[PDB]
mmCIF file with all atom_site columns, C-alpha atoms and ligand atoms in Angstrom:
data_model
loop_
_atom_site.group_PDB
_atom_site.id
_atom_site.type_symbol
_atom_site.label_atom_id
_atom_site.label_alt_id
_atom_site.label_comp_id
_atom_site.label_asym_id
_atom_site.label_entity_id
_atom_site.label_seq_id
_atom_site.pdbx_PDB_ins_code
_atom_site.Cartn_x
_atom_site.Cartn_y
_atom_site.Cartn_z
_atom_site.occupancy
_atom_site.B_iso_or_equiv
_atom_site.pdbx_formal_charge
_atom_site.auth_seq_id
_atom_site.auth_comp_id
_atom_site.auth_asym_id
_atom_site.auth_atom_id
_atom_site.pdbx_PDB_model_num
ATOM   1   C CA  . UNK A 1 1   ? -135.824 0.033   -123.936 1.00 0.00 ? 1   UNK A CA  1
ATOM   2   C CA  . UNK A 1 2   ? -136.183 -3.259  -122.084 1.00 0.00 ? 2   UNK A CA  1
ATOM   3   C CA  . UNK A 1 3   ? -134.435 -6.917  -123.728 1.00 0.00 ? 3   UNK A CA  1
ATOM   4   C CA  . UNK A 1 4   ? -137.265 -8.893  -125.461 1.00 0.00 ? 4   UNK A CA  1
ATOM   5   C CA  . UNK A 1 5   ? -137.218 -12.312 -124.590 1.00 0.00 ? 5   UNK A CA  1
ATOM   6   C CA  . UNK A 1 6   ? -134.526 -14.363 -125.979 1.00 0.00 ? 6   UNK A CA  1
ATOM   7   C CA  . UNK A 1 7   ? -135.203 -16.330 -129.428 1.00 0.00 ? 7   UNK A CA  1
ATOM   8   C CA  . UNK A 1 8   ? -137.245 -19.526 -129.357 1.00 0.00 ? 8   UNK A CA  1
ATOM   9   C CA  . UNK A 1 9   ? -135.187 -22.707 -128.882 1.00 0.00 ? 9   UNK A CA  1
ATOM   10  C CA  . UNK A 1 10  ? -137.620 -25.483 -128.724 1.00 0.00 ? 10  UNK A CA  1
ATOM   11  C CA  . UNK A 1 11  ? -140.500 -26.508 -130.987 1.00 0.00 ? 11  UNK A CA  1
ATOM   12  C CA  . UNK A 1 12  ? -142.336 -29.434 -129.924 1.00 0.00 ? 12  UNK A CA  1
ATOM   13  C CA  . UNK A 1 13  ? -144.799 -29.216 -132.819 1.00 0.00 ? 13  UNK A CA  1
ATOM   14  C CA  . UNK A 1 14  ? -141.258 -28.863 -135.121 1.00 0.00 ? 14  UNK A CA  1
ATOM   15  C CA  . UNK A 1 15  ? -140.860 -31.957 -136.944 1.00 0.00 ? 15  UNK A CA  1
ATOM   16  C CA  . UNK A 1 16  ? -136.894 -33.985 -135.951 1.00 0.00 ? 16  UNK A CA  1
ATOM   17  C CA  . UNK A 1 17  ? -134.478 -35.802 -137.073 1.00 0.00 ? 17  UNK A CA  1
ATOM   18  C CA  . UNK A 1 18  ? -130.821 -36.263 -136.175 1.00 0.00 ? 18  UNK A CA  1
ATOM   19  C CA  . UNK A 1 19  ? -128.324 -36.178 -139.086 1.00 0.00 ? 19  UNK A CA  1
ATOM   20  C CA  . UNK A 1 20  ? -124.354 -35.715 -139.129 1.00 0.00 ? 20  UNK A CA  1
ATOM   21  C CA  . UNK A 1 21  ? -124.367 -32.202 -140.425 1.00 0.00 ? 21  UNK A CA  1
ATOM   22  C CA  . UNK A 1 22  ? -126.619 -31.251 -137.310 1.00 0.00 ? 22  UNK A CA  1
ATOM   23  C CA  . UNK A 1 23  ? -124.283 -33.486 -134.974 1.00 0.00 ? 23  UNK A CA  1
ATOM   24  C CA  . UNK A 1 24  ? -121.371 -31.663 -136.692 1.00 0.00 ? 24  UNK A CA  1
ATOM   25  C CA  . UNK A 1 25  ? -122.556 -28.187 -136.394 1.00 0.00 ? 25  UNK A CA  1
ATOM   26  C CA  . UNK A 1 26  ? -122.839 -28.778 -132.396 1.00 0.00 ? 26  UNK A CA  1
ATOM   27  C CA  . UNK A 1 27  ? -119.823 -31.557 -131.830 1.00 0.00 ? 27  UNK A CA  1
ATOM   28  C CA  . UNK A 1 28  ? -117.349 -29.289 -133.740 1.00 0.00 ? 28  UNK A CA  1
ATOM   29  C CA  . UNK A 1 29  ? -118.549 -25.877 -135.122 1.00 0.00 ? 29  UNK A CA  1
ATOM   30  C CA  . UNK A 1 30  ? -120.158 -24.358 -132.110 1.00 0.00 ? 30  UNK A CA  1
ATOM   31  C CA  . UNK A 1 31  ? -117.868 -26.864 -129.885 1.00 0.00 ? 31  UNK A CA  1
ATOM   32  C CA  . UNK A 1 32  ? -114.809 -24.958 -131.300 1.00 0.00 ? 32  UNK A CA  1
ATOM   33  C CA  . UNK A 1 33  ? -116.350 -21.672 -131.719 1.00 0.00 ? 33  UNK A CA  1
ATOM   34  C CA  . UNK A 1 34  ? -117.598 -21.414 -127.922 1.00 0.00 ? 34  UNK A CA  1
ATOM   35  C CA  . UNK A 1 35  ? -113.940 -22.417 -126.843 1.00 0.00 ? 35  UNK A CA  1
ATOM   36  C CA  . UNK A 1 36  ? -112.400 -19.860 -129.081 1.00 0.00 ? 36  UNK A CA  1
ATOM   37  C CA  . UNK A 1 37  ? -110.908 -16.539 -126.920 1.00 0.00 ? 37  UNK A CA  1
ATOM   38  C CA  . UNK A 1 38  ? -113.301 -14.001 -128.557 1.00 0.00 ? 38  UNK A CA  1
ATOM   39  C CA  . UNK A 1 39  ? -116.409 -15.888 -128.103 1.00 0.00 ? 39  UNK A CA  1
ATOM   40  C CA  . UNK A 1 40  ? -117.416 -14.470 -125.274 1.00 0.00 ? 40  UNK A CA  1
ATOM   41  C CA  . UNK A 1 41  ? -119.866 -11.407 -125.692 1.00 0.00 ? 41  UNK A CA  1
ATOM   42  C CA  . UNK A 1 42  ? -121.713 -14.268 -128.658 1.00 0.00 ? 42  UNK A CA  1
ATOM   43  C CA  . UNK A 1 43  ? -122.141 -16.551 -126.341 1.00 0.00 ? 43  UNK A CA  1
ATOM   44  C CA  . UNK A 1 44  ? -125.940 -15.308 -125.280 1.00 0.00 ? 44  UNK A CA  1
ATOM   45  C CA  . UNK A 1 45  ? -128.929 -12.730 -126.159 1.00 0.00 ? 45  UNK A CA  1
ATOM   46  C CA  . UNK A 1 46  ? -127.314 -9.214  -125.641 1.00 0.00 ? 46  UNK A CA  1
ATOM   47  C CA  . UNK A 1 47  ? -128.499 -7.934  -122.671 1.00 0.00 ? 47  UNK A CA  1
ATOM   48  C CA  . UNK A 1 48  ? -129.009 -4.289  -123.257 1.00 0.00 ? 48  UNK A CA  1
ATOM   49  C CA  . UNK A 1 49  ? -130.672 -2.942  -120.556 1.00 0.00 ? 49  UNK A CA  1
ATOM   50  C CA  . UNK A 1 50  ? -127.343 -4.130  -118.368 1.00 0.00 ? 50  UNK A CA  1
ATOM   51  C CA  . UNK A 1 51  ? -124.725 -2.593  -121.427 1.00 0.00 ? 51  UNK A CA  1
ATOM   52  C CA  . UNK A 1 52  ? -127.090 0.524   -121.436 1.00 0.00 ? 52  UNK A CA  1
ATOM   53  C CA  . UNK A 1 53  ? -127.709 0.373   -124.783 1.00 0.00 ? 53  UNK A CA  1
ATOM   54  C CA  . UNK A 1 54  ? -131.904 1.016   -125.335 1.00 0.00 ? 54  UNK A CA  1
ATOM   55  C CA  . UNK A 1 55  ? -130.957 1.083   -128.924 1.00 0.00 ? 55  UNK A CA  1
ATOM   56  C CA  . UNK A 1 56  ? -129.977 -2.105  -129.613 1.00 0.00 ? 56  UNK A CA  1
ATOM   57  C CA  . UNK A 1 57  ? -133.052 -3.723  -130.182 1.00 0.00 ? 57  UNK A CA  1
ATOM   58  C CA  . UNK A 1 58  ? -134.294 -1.046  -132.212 1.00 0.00 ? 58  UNK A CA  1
ATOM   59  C CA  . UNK A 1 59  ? -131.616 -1.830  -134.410 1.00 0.00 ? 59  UNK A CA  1
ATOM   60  C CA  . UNK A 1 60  ? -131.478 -5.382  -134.602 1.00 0.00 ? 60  UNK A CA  1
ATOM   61  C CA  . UNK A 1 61  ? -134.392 -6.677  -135.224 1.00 0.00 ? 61  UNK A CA  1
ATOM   62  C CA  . UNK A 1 62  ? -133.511 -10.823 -135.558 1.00 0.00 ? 62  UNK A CA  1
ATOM   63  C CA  . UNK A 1 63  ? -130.975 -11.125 -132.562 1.00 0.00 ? 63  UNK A CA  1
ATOM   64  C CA  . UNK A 1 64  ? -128.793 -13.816 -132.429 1.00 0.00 ? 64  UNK A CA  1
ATOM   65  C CA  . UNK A 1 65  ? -126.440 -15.934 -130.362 1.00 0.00 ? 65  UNK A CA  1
ATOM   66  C CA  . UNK A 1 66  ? -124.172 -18.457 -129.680 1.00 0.00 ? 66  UNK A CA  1
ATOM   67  C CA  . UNK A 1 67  ? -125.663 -19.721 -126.179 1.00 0.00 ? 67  UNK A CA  1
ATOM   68  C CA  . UNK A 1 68  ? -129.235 -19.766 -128.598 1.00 0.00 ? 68  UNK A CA  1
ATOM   69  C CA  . UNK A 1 69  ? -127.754 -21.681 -131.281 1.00 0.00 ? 69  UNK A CA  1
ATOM   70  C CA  . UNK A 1 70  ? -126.527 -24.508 -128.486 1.00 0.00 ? 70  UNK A CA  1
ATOM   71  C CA  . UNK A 1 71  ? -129.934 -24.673 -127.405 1.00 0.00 ? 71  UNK A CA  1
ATOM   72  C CA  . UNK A 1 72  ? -131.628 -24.893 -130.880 1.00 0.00 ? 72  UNK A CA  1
ATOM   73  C CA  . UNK A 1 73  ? -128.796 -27.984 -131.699 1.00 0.00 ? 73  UNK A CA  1
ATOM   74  C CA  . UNK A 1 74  ? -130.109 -29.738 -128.368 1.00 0.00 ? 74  UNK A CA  1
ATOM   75  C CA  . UNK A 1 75  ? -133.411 -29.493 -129.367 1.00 0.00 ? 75  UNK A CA  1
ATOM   76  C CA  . UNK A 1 76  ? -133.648 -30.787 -133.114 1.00 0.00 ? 76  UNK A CA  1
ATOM   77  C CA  . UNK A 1 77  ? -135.128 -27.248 -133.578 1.00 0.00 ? 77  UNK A CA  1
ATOM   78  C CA  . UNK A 1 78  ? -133.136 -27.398 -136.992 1.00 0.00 ? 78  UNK A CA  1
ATOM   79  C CA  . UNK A 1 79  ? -134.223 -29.559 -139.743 1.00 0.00 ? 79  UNK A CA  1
ATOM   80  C CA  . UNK A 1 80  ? -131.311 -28.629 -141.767 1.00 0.00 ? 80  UNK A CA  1
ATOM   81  C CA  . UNK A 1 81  ? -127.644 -27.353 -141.749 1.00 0.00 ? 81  UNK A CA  1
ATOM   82  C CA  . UNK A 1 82  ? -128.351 -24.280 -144.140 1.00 0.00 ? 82  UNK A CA  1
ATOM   83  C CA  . UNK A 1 83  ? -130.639 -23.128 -140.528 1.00 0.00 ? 83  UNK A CA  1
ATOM   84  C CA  . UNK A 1 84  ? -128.365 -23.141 -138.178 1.00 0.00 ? 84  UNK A CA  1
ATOM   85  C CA  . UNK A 1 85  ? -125.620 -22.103 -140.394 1.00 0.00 ? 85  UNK A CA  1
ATOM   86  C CA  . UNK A 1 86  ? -128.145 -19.019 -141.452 1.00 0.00 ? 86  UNK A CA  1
ATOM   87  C CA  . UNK A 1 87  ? -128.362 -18.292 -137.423 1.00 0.00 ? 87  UNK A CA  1
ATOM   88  C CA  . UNK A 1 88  ? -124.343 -17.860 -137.194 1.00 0.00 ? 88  UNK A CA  1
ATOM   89  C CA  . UNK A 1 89  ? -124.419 -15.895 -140.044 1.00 0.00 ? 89  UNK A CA  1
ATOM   90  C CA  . UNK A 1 90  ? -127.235 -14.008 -138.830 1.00 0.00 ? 90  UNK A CA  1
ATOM   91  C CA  . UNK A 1 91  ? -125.006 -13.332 -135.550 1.00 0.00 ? 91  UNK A CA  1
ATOM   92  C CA  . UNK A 1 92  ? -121.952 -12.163 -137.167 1.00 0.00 ? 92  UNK A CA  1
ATOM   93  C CA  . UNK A 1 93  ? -124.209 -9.698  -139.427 1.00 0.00 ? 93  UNK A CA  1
ATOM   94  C CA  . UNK A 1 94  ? -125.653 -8.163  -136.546 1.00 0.00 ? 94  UNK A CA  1
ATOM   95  C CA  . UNK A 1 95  ? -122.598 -7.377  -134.949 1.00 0.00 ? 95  UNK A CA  1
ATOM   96  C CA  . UNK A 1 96  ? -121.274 -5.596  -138.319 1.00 0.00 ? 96  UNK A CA  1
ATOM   97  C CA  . UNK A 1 97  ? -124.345 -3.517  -138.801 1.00 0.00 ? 97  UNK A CA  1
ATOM   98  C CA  . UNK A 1 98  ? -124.513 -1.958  -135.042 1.00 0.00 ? 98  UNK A CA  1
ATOM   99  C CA  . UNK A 1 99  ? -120.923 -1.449  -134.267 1.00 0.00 ? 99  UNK A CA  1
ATOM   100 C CA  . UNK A 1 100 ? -118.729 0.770   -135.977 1.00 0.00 ? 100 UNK A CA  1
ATOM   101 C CA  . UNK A 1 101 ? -116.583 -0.879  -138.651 1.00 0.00 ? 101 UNK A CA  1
ATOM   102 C CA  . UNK A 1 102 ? -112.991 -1.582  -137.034 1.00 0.00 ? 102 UNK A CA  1
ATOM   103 C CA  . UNK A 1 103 ? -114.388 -1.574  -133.621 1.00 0.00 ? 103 UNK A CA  1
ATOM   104 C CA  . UNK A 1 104 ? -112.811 -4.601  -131.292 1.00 0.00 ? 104 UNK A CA  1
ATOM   105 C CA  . UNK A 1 105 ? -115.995 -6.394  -131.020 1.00 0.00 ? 105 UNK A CA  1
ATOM   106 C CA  . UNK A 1 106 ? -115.984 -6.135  -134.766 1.00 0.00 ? 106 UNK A CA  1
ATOM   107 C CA  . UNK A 1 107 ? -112.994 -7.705  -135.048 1.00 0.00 ? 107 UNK A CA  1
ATOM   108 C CA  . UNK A 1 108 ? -113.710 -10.610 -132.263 1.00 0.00 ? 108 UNK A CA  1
ATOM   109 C CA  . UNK A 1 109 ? -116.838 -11.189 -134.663 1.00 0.00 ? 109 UNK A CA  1
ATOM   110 C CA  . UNK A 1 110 ? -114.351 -11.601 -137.487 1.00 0.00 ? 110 UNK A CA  1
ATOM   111 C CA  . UNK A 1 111 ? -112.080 -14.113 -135.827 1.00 0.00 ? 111 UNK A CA  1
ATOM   112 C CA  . UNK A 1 112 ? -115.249 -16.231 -135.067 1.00 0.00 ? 112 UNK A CA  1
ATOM   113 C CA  . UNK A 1 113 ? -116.873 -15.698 -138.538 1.00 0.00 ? 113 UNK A CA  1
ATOM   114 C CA  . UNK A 1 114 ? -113.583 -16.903 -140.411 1.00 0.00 ? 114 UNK A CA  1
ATOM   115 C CA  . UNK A 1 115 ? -113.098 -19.633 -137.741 1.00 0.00 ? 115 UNK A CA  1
ATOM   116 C CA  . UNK A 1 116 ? -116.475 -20.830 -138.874 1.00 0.00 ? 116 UNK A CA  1
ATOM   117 C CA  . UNK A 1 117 ? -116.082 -20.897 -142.454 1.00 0.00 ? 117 UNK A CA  1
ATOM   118 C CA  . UNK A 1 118 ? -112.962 -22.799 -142.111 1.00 0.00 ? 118 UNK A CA  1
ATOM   119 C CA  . UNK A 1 119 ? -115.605 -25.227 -139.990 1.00 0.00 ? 119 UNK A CA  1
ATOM   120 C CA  . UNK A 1 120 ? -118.114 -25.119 -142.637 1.00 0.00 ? 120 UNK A CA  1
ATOM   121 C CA  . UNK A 1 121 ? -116.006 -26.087 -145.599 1.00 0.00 ? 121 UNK A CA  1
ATOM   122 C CA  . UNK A 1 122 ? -115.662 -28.895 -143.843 1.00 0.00 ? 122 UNK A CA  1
ATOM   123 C CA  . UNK A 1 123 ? -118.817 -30.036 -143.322 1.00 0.00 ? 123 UNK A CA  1
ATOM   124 C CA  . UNK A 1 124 ? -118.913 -33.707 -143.868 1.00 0.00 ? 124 UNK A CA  1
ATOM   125 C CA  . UNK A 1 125 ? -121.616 -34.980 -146.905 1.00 0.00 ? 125 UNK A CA  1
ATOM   126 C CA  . UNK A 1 126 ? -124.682 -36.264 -145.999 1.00 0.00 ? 126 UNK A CA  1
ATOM   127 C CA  . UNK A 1 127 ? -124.081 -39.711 -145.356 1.00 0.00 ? 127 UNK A CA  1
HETATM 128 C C1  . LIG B 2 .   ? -124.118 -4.939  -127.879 1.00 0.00 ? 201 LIG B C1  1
HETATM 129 C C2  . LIG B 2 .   ? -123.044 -4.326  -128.772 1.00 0.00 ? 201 LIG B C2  1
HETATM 130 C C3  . LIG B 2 .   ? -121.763 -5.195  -128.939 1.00 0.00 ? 201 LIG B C3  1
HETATM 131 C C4  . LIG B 2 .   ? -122.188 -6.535  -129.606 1.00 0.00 ? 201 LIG B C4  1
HETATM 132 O O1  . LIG B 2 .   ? -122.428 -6.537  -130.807 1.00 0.00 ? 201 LIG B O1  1
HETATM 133 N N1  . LIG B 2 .   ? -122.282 -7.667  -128.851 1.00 0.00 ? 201 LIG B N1  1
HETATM 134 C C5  . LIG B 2 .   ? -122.644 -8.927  -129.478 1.00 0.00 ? 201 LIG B C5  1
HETATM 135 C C6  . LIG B 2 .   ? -121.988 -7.635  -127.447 1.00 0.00 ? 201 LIG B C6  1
HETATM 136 C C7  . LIG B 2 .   ? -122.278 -8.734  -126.611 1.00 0.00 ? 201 LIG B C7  1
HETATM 137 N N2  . LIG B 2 .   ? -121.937 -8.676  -125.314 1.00 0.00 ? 201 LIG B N2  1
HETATM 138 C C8  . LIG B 2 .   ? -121.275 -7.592  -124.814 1.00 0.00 ? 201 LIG B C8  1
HETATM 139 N N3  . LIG B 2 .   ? -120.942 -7.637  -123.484 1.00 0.00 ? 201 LIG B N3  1
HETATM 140 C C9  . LIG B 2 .   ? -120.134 -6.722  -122.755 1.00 0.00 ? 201 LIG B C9  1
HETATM 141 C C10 . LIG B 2 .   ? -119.516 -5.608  -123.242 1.00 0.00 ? 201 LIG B C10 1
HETATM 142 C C11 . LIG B 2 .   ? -118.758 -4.830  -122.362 1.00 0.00 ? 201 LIG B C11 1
HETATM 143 C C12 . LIG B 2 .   ? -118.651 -5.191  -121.020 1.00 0.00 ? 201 LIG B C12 1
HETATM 144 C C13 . LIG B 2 .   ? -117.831 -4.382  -120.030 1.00 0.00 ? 201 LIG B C13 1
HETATM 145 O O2  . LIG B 2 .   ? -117.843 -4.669  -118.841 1.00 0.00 ? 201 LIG B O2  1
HETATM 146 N N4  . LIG B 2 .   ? -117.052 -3.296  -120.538 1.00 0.00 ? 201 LIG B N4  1
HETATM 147 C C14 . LIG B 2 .   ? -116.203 -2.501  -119.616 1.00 0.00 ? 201 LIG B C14 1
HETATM 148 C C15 . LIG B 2 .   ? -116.826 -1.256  -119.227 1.00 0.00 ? 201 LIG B C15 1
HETATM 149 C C16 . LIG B 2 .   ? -115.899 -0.460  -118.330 1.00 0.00 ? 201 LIG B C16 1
HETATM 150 N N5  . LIG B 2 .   ? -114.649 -0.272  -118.949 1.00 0.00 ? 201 LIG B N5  1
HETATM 151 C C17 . LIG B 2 .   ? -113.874 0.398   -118.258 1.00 0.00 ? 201 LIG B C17 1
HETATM 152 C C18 . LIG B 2 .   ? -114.052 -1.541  -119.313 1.00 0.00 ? 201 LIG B C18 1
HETATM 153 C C19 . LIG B 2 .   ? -114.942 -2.322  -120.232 1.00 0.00 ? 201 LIG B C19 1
HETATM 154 C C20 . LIG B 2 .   ? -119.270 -6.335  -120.548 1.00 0.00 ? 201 LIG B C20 1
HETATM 155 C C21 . LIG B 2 .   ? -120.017 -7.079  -121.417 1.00 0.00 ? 201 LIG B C21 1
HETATM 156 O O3  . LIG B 2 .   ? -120.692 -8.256  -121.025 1.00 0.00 ? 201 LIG B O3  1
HETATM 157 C C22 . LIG B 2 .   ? -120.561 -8.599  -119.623 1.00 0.00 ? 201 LIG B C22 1
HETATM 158 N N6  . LIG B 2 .   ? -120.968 -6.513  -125.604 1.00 0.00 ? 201 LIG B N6  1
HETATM 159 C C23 . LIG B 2 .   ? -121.344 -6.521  -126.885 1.00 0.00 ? 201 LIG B C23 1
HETATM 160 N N7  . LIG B 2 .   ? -121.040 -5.362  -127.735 1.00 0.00 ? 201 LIG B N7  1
HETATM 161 C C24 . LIG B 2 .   ? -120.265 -4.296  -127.010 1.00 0.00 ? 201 LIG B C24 1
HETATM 162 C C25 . LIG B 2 .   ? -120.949 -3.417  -126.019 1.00 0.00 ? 201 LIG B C25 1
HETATM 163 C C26 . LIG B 2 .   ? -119.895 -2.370  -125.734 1.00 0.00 ? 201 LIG B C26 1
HETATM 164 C C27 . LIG B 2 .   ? -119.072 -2.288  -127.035 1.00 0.00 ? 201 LIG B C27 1
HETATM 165 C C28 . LIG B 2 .   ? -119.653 -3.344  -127.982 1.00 0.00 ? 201 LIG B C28 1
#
């Protein structure tokens, strides 16, 4: 099957506002994620028509990606933390549910997903 477009990233009608756990979640959680050595294959949609695989989006249903998640930080598309966090979660889920358990994109999903947490506990207070 062919990709479906990528996920929205901009919502003019989506009310804004700039806070420091949104300014967090791009200056240092994605920040450090992107620059990590496995971040590679999260770092956009999946392009399955180039990888060959016309199954992917018949399995995953609510892709998700890094270069997405950028994009929805740059445009106050997030009104809240628990949203974008739910987006990197959302990534890291899809990657365990179409690969096989143990496989190494598995386990470059891992480093990223405890890499994050880590990030995430120290998300400063609302302030
Ligand atoms: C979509 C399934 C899964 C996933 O979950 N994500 C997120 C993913 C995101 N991006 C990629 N990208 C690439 C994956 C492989 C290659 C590549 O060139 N592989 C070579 C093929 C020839 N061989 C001799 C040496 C290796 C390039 C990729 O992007 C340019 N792969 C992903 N995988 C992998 C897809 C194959 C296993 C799992």
């Amino acid at each position: 099957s062919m990709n479906p477009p990528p996920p929205e990233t901009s919502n003019p009608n989506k009310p804004k506002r700039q806070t420091n756990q949104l300014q967090y979640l791009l200056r240092v959680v994605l920040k450090t994620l992107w620059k990590h050595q496995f971040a590679w294959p999260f770092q956009q949609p999946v392009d399955a028509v180039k990888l060959n695989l016309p199954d992917y989006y018949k399995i995953i249903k609510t892709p998700m990606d890094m270069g997405t998640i950028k994009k929805r930080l740059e445009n106050n598309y997030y009104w809240n933390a628990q949203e974008c966090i739910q987006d990197f979660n959302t990534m890291f889920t899809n990657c365990y549910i179409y690969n096989k358990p143990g496989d190494d994109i598995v386990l470059m999903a891992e480093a990223l997903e405890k890499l994050f947490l880590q990030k995430i506990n120290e998300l400063p207070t609302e302030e």
